[PDB]
Structure 1
């Protein structure tokens, strides 16, 4: 069976890539993702200038996933642009860059720099509208006026196909409102559902203390916590945004979860917490497991079942 995905003129060997933020901050990280069996990779959500991020501890692995408040530690846009222009081996796989300016002005400055490199190399933009661990910066995706402004200014500045990393929604009316904004921007060719379930709290019963230092212990949840939310968001936008692709992100630990994401509507499938836990070898495993399911069900390609989840 074929795991191939054909989107934006590119051939991807399989639907798997890292979730933005995991194994993608440094040159070494990005090398390891390139050498892995993943179909693609994405750079850390970057800002105009470098950031060291939040104080420690800011990450904690959980039995059911992860909580983090990293605070967008990144080497700055120039580093990732340079990686995309000079270092990355495009013969191995295509590259995405995530950009997370803390203002529309910052985002505009950054994407303008990407234009020449997208034209030359084919580097793909994911605009992050859901960074939940920066003190004093609300998630853009939870204000539809602000979301409209970002999409307007970035569409105009970048002028090329791009995608958006969205926060999870939990209300039908929000799925509708979000889709209505997204559908006004034709250059938005993909939607990544979802970012962390924002601002959860984990407390250690032994010492009666929170497990992360920033924001009084409040951090984004990933892993097993997020699968049903992720599947819901993937399916909601798959149906509401037929002119666009949907990328799935959340709760993928196995080919089974990957299969469910694709059944829900996903084109690419991103792996965060599970990759942080296991390392890039996970991609070899995911390919094997997804192949096995497709073999068992007699699916020859992903296109035979993408978005074909059955309702009652």
Structure 2
């Protein structure tokens, strides 16, 4: 009864309520488990790990690590636990989430509503053994670290997030996308330093997530600092504060970050630029408006080693995960790529 009923409920609910119900339904494992088997050609070895498939769920869906197993069960090659702030906080006042149906877009200004490190840490440790096996089987767990609203030292918040959740993550993410090149360098250096100070052999990779709203200078500074400090990767494109001419959703004037289709090509272009600026030496996780295997391939070809999607799940439902992987698989063969890895950065080989 999962499908059939869920599509209806979605239409009868405001976007935030629909979001919370989706997380619940997913954690309870009420959705059918994907039968699609990830072929060897979809495997990507990057960030010190193995990814059975290159399609993950972007940060922000499961902010509190409540539906991880259910997400892998849907077919995602990896999961990124939504932004986690040190202390719990409620985020911005409602309404803070809006659907733009006609544009297959969403606008949100959640404001980092989070359960906090203690809670998320408890949840993830309760399933650490299970995750250790999932990871070993090529299903990595990423954890996106955020900072509290009234926090003074952003770096201190991120570091606390590194010490607290780092032991449970395969990779960690720090947003600069939810000051000059100098403050960016110092903030990241402290994050990496905290990462290197973690106990154990398997040190999680550290990625920087950027918005698509960057000046020519911002892009060069990020590439330079990333290259200089030895950052492990870049997640390219959080939501955008721009509102493209031609948006038809009546709620387009609302403040917040725009995601979904309108962000698709802007995001890909940003991946192309960052890849070039870093000379293809820094793994990029492409994200933004991915709704088909075609969209994923465009991002991979522009420079992404892996991709993520979120908004498409909202307008196409859970079937979108397997659909993107299946199409991506057929498009790779059709275009002469024997494996996903061979397509990474393909547009840059000319």
TM-score range, shorter chain: 0.7 to 0.9
Aligned to 1:222: 259
Query: How has the CA–CA distance of structure 1 residues 44 and 172 changed in structure 2, closer, same or farther, with 3 Å as cutoff?
Result: same
* Aligned: 1:117 with 2:168: yes
- Of the candidates 266, 281, 287, which is equivalent to residue 243 of structure 1? 281
- Of the candidates 239, 253, 275, which is equivalent to residue 196 of structure 1? 239
Aligned to 1:68: 108
C-alpha displacement at 1:26, in angstroms?
4.3
* Aligned: 1:106 with 2:167: no
Relative contact order: is structure 1 or structure 2 higher (C-alpha 8 Å, sep ≥ 6)?
A: 1
C-alpha displacement at 1:101, in angstroms?
1.5
What 5-or-longer segments of structure 2 have no aligned partner?
Answer: 1-38, 149-153, 197-202
Query: How has the CA–CA distance of structure 1 residues 169 and 278 changed in structure 2, closer, same or farther, with 3 Å as cutoff?
Result: same
Q: Secondary structure at the match of 2:347?
A: coil
* Aligned: 1:48 with 2:86: yes
The residue correspondences of 1:78-157 to structure 2 (distance < 5 A) are 78-87=118-127, 89-90=130-131, 91-92=133-134, 93-102=139-148, 103-118=154-169, 123-131=170-178, 143-157=180-194
Deviates more, 1:65-74 or 1:99-108: 99-108
Count of aligned positions: 290
Aligned to 1:135: none
Q: Secondary structure at the match of 2:67?
A: helix
Task: Tell me, in whole angstroms, the C-alpha distance in 1 between the residues paired with 2:232 and 2:142.
Answer: 13
- 1:134-163, CA deviations, whole angstroms, 9 ceiling, x for partnerless residues? xxxxxxxx7433322210211111224311
Task: Tell me, in whole angstroms, the C-alpha distance in 2 between the residues paired with 1:154 and 1:289.
Answer: 37
* Aligned: 1:11 with 2:62: no
**1:51·1:75 contact (CA, 8 Å) conserved in 2?**
yes
What 5-or-longer segments of structure 1 have no aligned partner?
Answer: 132-141
User: Hey, which of these two has a bigger chunk of strand by percent?
Assistant: 1
TM-score when normalising by structure 2: 0.75
Query: How has the CA–CA distance of structure 1 residues 25 and 289 changed in structure 2, closer, same or farther, with 3 Å as cutoff?
Result: same
Query: How has the CA–CA distance of structure 1 residues 147 and 280 changed in structure 2, closer, same or farther, with 3 Å as cutoff?
Result: farther
**2:65·2:124 contact (CA, 8 Å) conserved in 1?**
no
Aligned to 1:234: 271
Q: Secondary structure at the match of 1:309?
A: helix
